[PDB]
Amino acid sequence: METITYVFIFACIIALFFFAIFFREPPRIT
Amino acid sequence: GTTGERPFSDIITSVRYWVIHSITIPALFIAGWLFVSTGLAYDVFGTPRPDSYYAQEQRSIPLVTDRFEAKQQVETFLEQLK
Amino acid sequence: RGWFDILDDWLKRDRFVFVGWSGILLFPCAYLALGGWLTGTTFVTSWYTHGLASSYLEGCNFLTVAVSTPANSMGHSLLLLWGPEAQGDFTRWCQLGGLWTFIALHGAFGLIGFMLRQFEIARLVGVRPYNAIAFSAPIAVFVSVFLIYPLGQSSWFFAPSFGVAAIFRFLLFFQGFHNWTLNPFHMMGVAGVLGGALLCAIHGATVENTLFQDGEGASTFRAFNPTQAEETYSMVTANRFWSQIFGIAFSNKRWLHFFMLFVPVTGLWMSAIGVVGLALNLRSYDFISQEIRAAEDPEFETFYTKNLLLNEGIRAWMAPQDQPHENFVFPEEVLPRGNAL
Amino acid sequence: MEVNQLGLIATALFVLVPSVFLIILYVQTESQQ
Amino acid sequence: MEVNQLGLIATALFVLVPSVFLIILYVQTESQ
Amino acid sequence: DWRVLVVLLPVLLAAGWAVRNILPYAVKQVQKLL
Amino acid sequence: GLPWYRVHTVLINDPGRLIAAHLMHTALVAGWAGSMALYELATFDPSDPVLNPMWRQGMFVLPFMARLGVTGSWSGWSITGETGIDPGFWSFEGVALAHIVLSGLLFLAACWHWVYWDLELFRDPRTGEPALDLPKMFGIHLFLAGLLCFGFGAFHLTGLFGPGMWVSDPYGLTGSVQPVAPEWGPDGFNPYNPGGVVAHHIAAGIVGIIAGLFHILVRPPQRLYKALRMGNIETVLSSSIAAVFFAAFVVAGTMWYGSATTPIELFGPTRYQWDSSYFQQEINRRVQASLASGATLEEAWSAIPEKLAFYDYIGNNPAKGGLFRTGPMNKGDGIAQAWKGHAVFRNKEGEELFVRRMPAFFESFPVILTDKNGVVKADIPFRRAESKYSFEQQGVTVSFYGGELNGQTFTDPPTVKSYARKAIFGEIFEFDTETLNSDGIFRTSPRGWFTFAHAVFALLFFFGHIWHGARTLFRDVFSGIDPELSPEQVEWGFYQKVGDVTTRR
Amino acid sequence: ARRTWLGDILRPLNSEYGKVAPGWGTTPLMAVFMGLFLVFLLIILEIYNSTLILDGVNVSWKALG
Amino acid sequence: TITPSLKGFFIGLLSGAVVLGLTFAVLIAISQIDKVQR
Amino acid sequence: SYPIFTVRWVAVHTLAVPTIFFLGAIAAMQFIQR
Amino acid sequence: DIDGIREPVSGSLLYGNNIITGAVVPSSNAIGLHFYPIWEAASLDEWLYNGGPYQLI
Amino acid sequence: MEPNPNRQPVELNRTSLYLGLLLILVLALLFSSYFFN
Amino acid sequence: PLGISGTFNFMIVFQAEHNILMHPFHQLGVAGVFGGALFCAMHGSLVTSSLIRETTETESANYGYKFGQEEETYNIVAAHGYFGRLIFQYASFNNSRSLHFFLAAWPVVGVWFTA
Numbered sequence A: 001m002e003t004i005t006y007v008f009i010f011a012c013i014i015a016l017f018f019f020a021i022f023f024r025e026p027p028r029i030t
Numbered sequence B: 001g002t003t004g005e006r007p008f009s010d011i012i013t014s015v016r017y018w019v020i021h022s023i024t025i026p027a028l029f030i031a032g033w034l035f036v037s038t039g040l041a042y043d044v045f046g047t048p049r050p051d052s053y054y055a056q057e058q059r060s061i062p063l064v065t066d067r068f069e070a071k072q073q074v075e076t077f078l079e080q081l082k
Numbered sequence C: 001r002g003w004f005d006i007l008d009d010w011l012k013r014d015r016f017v018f019v020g021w022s023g024i025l026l027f028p029c030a031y032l033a034l035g036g037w038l039t040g041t042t043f044v045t046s047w048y049t050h051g052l053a054s055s056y057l058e059g060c061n062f063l064t065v066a067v068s069t070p071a072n073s074m075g076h077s078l079l080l081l082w083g084p085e086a087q088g089d090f091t092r093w094c095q096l097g098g099l100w101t102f103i104a105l106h107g108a109f110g111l112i113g114f115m116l117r118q119f120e121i122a123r124l125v126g127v128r129p130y131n132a133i134a135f136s137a138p139i140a141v142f143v144s145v146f147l148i149y150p151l152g153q154s155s156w157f158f159a160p161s162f163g164v165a166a167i168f169r170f171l172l173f174f175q176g177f178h179n180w181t182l183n184p185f186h187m188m189g190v191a192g193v194l195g196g197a198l199l200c201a202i203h204g205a206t207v208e209n210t211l212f213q214d215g216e217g218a219s220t221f222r223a224f225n226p227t228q229a230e231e232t233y234s235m236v237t238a239n240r241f242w243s244q245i246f247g248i249a250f251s252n253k254r255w256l257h258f259f260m261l262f263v264p265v266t267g268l269w270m271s272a273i274g275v276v277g278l279a280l281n282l283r284s285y286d287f288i289s290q291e292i293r294a295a296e297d298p299e300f301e302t303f304y305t306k307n308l309l310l311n312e313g314i315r316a317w318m319a320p321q322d323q324p325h326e327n328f329v330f331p332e333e334v335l336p337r338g339n340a341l
Numbered sequence D: 001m002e003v004n005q006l007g008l009i010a011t012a013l014f015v016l017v018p019s020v021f022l023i024i025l026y027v028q029t030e031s032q033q
Numbered sequence E: 001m002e003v004n005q006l007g008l009i010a011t012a013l014f015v016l017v018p019s020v021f022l023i024i025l026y027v028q029t030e031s032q
Numbered sequence F: 001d002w003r004v005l006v007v008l009l010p011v012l013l014a015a016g017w018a019v020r021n022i023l024p025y026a027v028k029q030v031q032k033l034l
Numbered sequence G: 001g002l003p004w005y006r007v008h009t010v011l012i013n014d015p016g017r018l019i020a021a022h023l024m025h026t027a028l029v030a031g032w033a034g035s036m037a038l039y040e041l042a043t044f045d046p047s048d049p050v051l052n053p054m055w056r057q058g059m060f061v062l063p064f065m066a067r068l069g070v071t072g073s074w075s076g077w078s079i080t081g082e083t084g085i086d087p088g089f090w091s092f093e094g095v096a097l098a099h100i101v102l103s104g105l106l107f108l109a110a111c112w113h114w115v116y117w118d119l120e121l122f123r124d125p126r127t128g129e130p131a132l133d134l135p136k137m138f139g140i141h142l143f144l145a146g147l148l149c150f151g152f153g154a155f156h157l158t159g160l161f162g163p164g165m166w167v168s169d170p171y172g173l174t175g176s177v178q179p180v181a182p183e184w185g186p187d188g189f190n191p192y193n194p195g196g197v198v199a200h201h202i203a204a205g206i207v208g209i210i211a212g213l214f215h216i217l218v219r220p221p222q223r224l225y226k227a228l229r230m231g232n233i234e235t236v237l238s239s240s241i242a243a244v245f246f247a248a249f250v251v252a253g254t255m256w257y258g259s260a261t262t263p264i265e266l267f268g269p270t271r272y273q274w275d276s277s278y279f280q281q282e283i284n285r286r287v288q289a290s291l292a293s294g295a296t297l298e299e300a301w302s303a304i305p306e307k308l309a310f311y312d313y314i315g316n317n318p319a320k321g322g323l324f325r326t327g328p329m330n331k332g333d334g335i336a337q338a339w340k341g342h343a344v345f346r347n348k349e350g351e352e353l354f355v356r357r358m359p360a361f362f363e364s365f366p367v368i369l370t371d372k373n374g375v376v377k378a379d380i381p382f383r384r385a386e387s388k389y390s391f392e393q394q395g396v397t398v399s400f401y402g403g404e405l406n407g408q409t410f411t412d413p414p415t416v417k418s419y420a421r422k423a424i425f426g427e428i429f430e431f432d433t434e435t436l437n438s439d440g441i442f443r444t445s446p447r448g449w450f451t452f453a454h455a456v457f458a459l460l461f462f463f464g465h466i467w468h469g470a471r472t473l474f475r476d477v478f479s480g481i482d483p484e485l486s487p488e489q490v491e492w493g494f495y496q497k498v499g500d501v502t503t504r505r
Numbered sequence H: 001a002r003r004t005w006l007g008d009i010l011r012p013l014n015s016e017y018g019k020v021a022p023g024w025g026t027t028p029l030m031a032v033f034m035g036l037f038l039v040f041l042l043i044i045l046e047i048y049n050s051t052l053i054l055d056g057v058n059v060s061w062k063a064l065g
Numbered sequence I: 001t002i003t004p005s006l007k008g009f010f011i012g013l014l015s016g017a018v019v020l021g022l023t024f025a026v027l028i029a030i031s032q033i034d035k036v037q038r
Numbered sequence J: 001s002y003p004i005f006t007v008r009w010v011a012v013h014t015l016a017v018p019t020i021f022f023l024g025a026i027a028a029m030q031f032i033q034r
Numbered sequence K: 001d002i003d004g005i006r007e008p009v010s011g012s013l014l015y016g017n018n019i020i021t022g023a024v025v026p027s028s029n030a031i032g033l034h035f036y037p038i039w040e041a042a043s044l045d046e047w048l049y050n051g052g053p054y055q056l057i
Numbered sequence L: 001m002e003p004n005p006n007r008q009p010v011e012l013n014r015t016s017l018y019l020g021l022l023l024i025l026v027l028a029l030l031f032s033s034y035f036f037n
Numbered sequence M: 001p002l003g004i005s006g007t008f009n010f011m012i013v014f015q016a017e018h019n020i021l022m023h024p025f026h027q028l029g030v031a032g033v034f035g036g037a038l039f040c041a042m043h044g045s046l047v048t049s050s051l052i053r054e055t056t057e058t059e060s061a062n063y064g065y066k067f068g069q070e071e072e073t074y075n076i077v078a079a080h081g082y083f084g085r086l087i088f089q090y091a092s093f094n095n096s097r098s099l100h101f102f103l104a105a106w107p108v109v110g111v112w113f114t115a
């Protein structure tokens, strides 16, 4: 159960990487 | 800007500056030297001299072990040398 | 227009070194903590508190000199020069460890003084007081390590001594006795310090390599004026660079600089909290599940079990000389050793 | 391994409670637009 | 009583997950 | 004891010498203070 | 909108909803107290305060109820082991119920004050703007604080009209709620003198009353009202936080060193009592006193109360714990059942040997037996090949006097090494490890867990002091410095005095 | 705003917002009490620390009996 | 009754008064001579 | 028209004077034999 | 077997490690500085024993 | 009785979401080993 | 090793075999990394201290800055004037190019040495 927990949190972090790069609030100028 | 103290680069290239400090600077170096060379520094601070870390046939540290008798313990440890 | 306001005027004059009301506390205290360290390190032994030489006068060099903690027998005595231990004898005070409390205490009050100075100058000049705020981090570290930690233990003796190598020994004490690397609060400290040095390097480099051409010459420093209103580098080209290199960039120069405050301050505050627990020997020493399996299963070995053999070595080999008041006698046959070494 | 059984409910809530807080605040920010 | 350990986590998530869904949906209704 | 005058004497002459050399220019500074 | 970290600033000029929030906080805190007690009562074993006191079972609020006089349960037991008693309503159970009722009444009040926020009371009658006369409220609240502080000392603590407080002998053997008389002498400042606790509260009580009187009638000086922004409620938060972390440092220190208000039967021994062999000295004093009047060894040791022998054991040292080793101390070494006896080691020569005790710093420690004179005479060797001092070679034996093994002597080396291993912990106890599935690793006491929490909170609240005080003195630039700050100001030598534009040169 | 019986009664205690004594008012007397209080905290601290040792004051558990 | 450590306390207290008061004497004087002009 | 003795002046010599004195002391020390 | 002494060290989660104690363990001292790609091993079981993944990573 | 004038909308933008999520997930990843012990 | 505890193993054994604490290049690394953490916080505290008022107290100060705005968002002379008085005038920067190069160079160089 602890192995499932460590790997699940890691996988959630990798998923958040994906959204934060490809689905970010785009920076716009002035 | 500036606060109206005299600039450092003016002072230290000044003649009067180097007239005072060519005496003051070495005099302190020599005073500090003598503080050591006379052995006054050993006595002021209580620092063991190379010959006074241990008693001769002795190899235990004179280590303070009481809070309130600590002063007297150091002093007894010293009489173990004279 | 009484004497208070006249003294306030004189303290707050613009001079080469600003004084302020906070300089009354800061300037004697900082001077004296610093003088005490140089005085002890040049002239003062540790023979009677530790069994160590610790001064230049005795043959030590810059790396081995220290003002050392008092003997364990002084408990948490303030070790005032006029108090019952040295009884006003300056020599016995020096020999008994008195300069340690001197330095540490005038240190504590100097750090207050300095931080009040940051408040005081910030109020007079009209800026927000975040530099002071950030300086709470160094204060937390100092008080937690030099004051709170030995107060939970038996005595000042176990605080860090003021010296390069004495601190190194403190670092290694904490590994073997407290297993301090295993502590998450230290780990978050490490991540904040290293995170800071990272952000420092990466931010200086970004600015310096997104500079606008504002002068003709090859030295690009000259083409900055402190009074220009224009930003001197392109936040936009920096954002593109880092978006495409790393996937995310900063986009808000205010967030960026707040983040540079936040990261290292936080990290230090975190390690401080961990030390507070180590004051009580509330260590992050073991993982129970590992010890249970390890004990039952002689084939189970992890880098965790390997590191505690190391700490166990440190303890047994270092303790008699580091804790001489305990008269630890470990005959050869009881010292933990692996094969041949 | 002989790991503590509330480790799991501790870890799950440590994650879920503050995550849900932030999600709630974000979603209702975006429907203000 | 010798009950199921996972019963606590199953009960807690059973409450927590669907409740949070409703709370998310309701608060963003109100703020528009 | 004696070592204390040995040590102290360079610094007395040192502060004697600077005082002589600077005494004129120092009197100006203080009079300007009203 | 507001950032998440500022949602609660909507209360800064809403005295009514500020009150409702303070009521809600006070409800939650008193609800916790009731919930925590009920949980403790449901998991507490009252059946052996010698070897399973509250402090071994991880009880945290029990001891604070007992400290002030709540000693018994409606089930008939009391924490001194007195049985058949009737505590009336102020039992553990009744105290827990009182706080939950309180919690629920406060929650209803909060609803009222959140709804009827716009009370005329909160309005300045001059301007119509909401405002709190902070200086006069301080005198009001101070005067109440002094009344209560006085009453608590004069009536609860004296037993003039109350139970007293927990007092004990120096070795933690005979504690009980007793009325305490005030110590007005200089020994009332002795942390270890309970009568000084009574004096403190009487005298500080009267000073609080006198000072509250002063602060209700005397307006603050103008210099001071401007200096400290006494029309800004956040300056009260800044100073309040400072006073709070001062207090948190004090209570963590008295909990760790020990004082009359942290007796060891409610909280456990301190680490210093192990450092200085405090119970061991006294145990030895008593065995010598027996031997003097010619009591056999068996008899002199049998006279040692098991409760005193249990204090002389490193497993109750609050400095043997770990941050993530959770639960009661009982979860570690187990539930103490019996003192096995005091263990006496001798070599084949008849010399008596002594186990060198483990110090609190060491998770592990070698087994080294010394003679009266400090000279090492046996150990358990790590490397066997050059071993000189082994139990096998030195003929070491263990004899027990007192306890469960009184009169018993073991000679076979694997047994003698076994008790030698436990002897570094001090006195040797029989534990039950099956019941709580104990894993055998020491945990800290409530003395330790309290000190740790309060030392950490104190430090954190110090940064809140710094934050909220910075925010008071610099309110005017919270959002940023003036965009028309001109470089003549922050540059050197334009003004004689820094920031004073009237000192221009 | 809403008037209430209890409010009308407590009314005068929240009526002098803003009011000050002039200049320094009592500030010198405050200062005397602070200094007194610090010495007092000092003695309490140094007693607990056994840096101040008074007659008949045995800063140990052995003072409980 | 009036013990060595209580005599030392008073030596400390006096020493501190002299240092703080002597410091402030000097500060008040300088500030009176050397004033800022408005 | 500069003052000689100022606050700055005192800060410097508060640091500079004992530095040199300590420097001469440490100098002597290199010549100590056991 | 990081140190060549046929004393294998468990680094991975399924073998009783947590996030703190787990590692990819360095390759065997028996290999020293020799290049140990997968195709030099008789099987992946051997390559795993001797620490091949660390060299690859 | 007038409705309360001190209400204010609260905001969490998307970058603040990603940052907080990341902080909580890495915190969880760090402390979990210690909760299972 | 590629693991958290493995890292600690390697740095413990390194110290027994090399006394890296007493090696000067590690000492510069500490100075490089303690130093960069310090200046990180300095630069971020001093910039944050001298932001120009653009917002109200109900809003994050960060909305004072818009991505790609041409004017600076803090006043570096107010910043120079604070830090120069905290220490003394010439121990503070007022060329932002030299300041950021210093930020870049201190930790990079110290980490070169420890490498």
Ligand code: CLA
Residues within 6 Å of the ligand: C024, C025, C028, C029, C032, C078, C079, C080, C081, C082, C098, C101, C102, C103, C105, C106, C109, H035, I012, I013, I014, I015, I016, I017, I019, I020
């Ligand atoms: C403001 C600057 C400052 C501050 C904050 C401190 C702070 C401290 N010093 Mg340091 N010191 C200073 C300046 C300062 N010092 C200076 C300028 C020197 C050079 C002489 C020294 C030299 C020095 C030494 C040599 C020692 C200290 C020590 C100490 C500590 C104990 C002080 C103590 O017990 O106070 C007690 C006294 C007070 C707090 C003063 C109280 C003032 C009250 C308000 C006035 C009372 C009036 C009076 C008694 C009435 C007289 C009546 C008359 C008619 C008889 C403390 C950390 C000791 C230390 O570090 O121990 C390890 C120590 O041994 N100091």
Ligand code: CLA
Residues within 6 Å of the ligand: G039, G040, G043, G057, G058, G059, G060, G323, G324, G325, G326, G327, G328, G445, G446, G449, G450, G453, L031
């Ligand atoms: C001042 C607070 C306080 C104190 C000192 C104690 C002390 C105690 N409690 Mg109580 N308790 C409290 C509050 C407190 N409690 C509260 C608020 C609750 C309700 C949640 C409880 C509920 C409770 C139960 C249900 C039980 C106890 C038990 C116990 C005992 C064991 C404690 C233990 O193992 O902790 C272990 C401590 C830890 C594992 C430390 C946790 C802190 C982590 C490391 C930090 C969290 C991460 C953080 C976010 C850091 C990153 C921030 C960064 C971004 C800045 C002990 C005597 C037990 C007992 O023995 O019962 C009789 C028991 O079963 N307590």
Ligand code: CLA
Residues within 6 Å of the ligand: G004, G005, G006, G007, G008, G009, G237, G241, G460, G461, G462, G463, G464, G465, G467, G468, G471
């Ligand atoms: C009585 C103590 C007290 C009080 C009433 C306040 C009140 C306030 N603070 Mg201060 N503060 C305090 C202590 C206090 N603080 C302490 C000890 C610190 C140091 C940690 C701070 C540091 C601090 C900062 C740094 C800031 C404030 C701010 C504020 C304001 C907005 C807070 C808000 O919306 O939070 C909103 C909080 C949340 C929405 C959730 C946070 C949850 C936290 C992280 C952890 C979980 C808490 C847990 C459930 C309960 C705590 C238990 C424990 C304390 C017993 C408000 C006036 C802000 C401000 O000034 O705005 C102008 C601001 O920026 N506070």
Ligand SMILES: C=Cc1c(C)c2cc3nc(c4c5[nH]c(cc6nc(cc1[nH]2)C(C)=C6CC)c(C)c5C(=O)[C@@H]4C(=O)OC)[C@@H](CCC(=O)OC/C=C(\C)CCC[C@H](C)CCC[C@H](C)CCCC(C)C)[C@@H]3C
Residues within 6 Å of the ligand: C029, C030, C033, C034, C037, C103, C104, C106, C107, C108, C109, C110, C111, C114, C131, C132, C134, C135, C137, C138, C142, C161, C162, C163, C164, C167, C193, C196, C264, C265, C268, M034, M037, M038, M039, M041, M042, M045, M086
């Ligand atoms: C060893 C590491 C280290 C050192 C030496 C250090 C040094 C300093 N930091 C300062 C500032 C800061 N530090 C900050 C963040 C950080 N500081 C950190 C780490 C350090 N910071 C870290 C990691 C961070 C990131 C959070 C900030 C944000 C600031 C500032 O604003 C401030 C500054 O001006 O920066 C340029 C200065 C304040 C000096 C002072 O108070 O003068 C007065 C001197 C006094 C009061 C004497 C103190 C006495 C000390 C405490 C005890 C005695 C020490 C002995 C003299 C020396 C013994 C040393 C032996 C062990 C070798 C000073 C240069």
Ligand SMILES: CCCCCCCCCCCCCCCC(=O)OC[C@H](COP(=O)(O)OC[C@@H](O)CO)OC(=O)CCCCCCCCCCCCCCC
Residues within 6 Å of the ligand: B006, B007, B008, B009, B010, C017, J011, J012, J015, M086, M087, M088, M089, M090, M091, M092, M093, M094
């Ligand atoms: C590593 C940092 C290097 C940054 C370099 C400079 C940043 C740029 C400065 C902006 C204006 C440009 C001038 C640049 C050029 C510049 O750097 O000039 C260095 C400066 C020159 O001062 P003068 O007035 O002599 O200037 C002559 C020049 O005008 C030549 O043109 O020297 C000093 O400040 C010496 C100070 C030693 C002071 C001795 C110690 C005093 C003790 C004080 C105690 C400390 C305070 C306590 C607080 C707790």
Ligand SMILES: CC1=C(/C=C/C(C)=C/C=C/C(C)=C/C=C/C=C(C)/C=C/C=C(C)/C=C/C2=C(C)CCCC2(C)C)C(C)(C)CCC1
Residues within 6 Å of the ligand: C031, C032, C034, C035, C036, C038, C039, J014, J015, J018, J019, J020, J022, J023
């Ligand atoms: C303690 C005490 C006190 C005080 C004192 C004092 C305050 C002191 C001071 C002191 C000091 C004030 C000293 C100083 C010294 C110094 C030194 C000794 C220095 C040295 C340095 C050096 C060595 C440097 C060099 C270098 C190098 C090496 C490299 C780089 C470059 C340079 C140049 C930097 C009193 C009386 C109050 C009383 C009590 C006791």
Ligand SMILES: CC1=C(/C=C/C(C)=C/C=C/C(C)=C/C=C/C=C(C)/C=C/C=C(C)/C=C/C2=C(C)CCCC2(C)C)C(C)(C)CCC1
Residues within 6 Å of the ligand: G027, G028, G029, G030, G031, G032, G035, G100, G101, G102, G103, G104, G105, G107, G108
């Ligand atoms: C309505 C009402 C009622 C009812 C009442 C009730 C039933 C109450 C309850 C209440 C309660 C029952 C409460 C409780 C509370 C709780 C709480 C408040 C808790 C706390 C928590 C905390 C805060 C925690 C935290 C933490 C954690 C979690 C982890 C570790 C760390 C810490 C410690 C931080 C009555 C009948 C009276 C009457 C009528 C009205």
Ligand SMILES: CCCCCCCCCCCCCCCCCC(=O)O
Residues within 6 Å of the ligand: C081, C082, C087, C088, C089, I008, I011, I012, I015, I016, I017, I019, I020
């Ligand atoms: C906050 C103010 C604190 C400043 C106090 C500094 C005190 C100055 C040190 C004075 C010590 C001189 C006497 C030392 C002991 C003399 C011998 C004796 O006890 O009779």
Ligand SMILES: [Fe+2]
Residues within 6 Å of the ligand: C203, C207, C257, M043, M047, M100
């Ligand atoms: Fe920048």
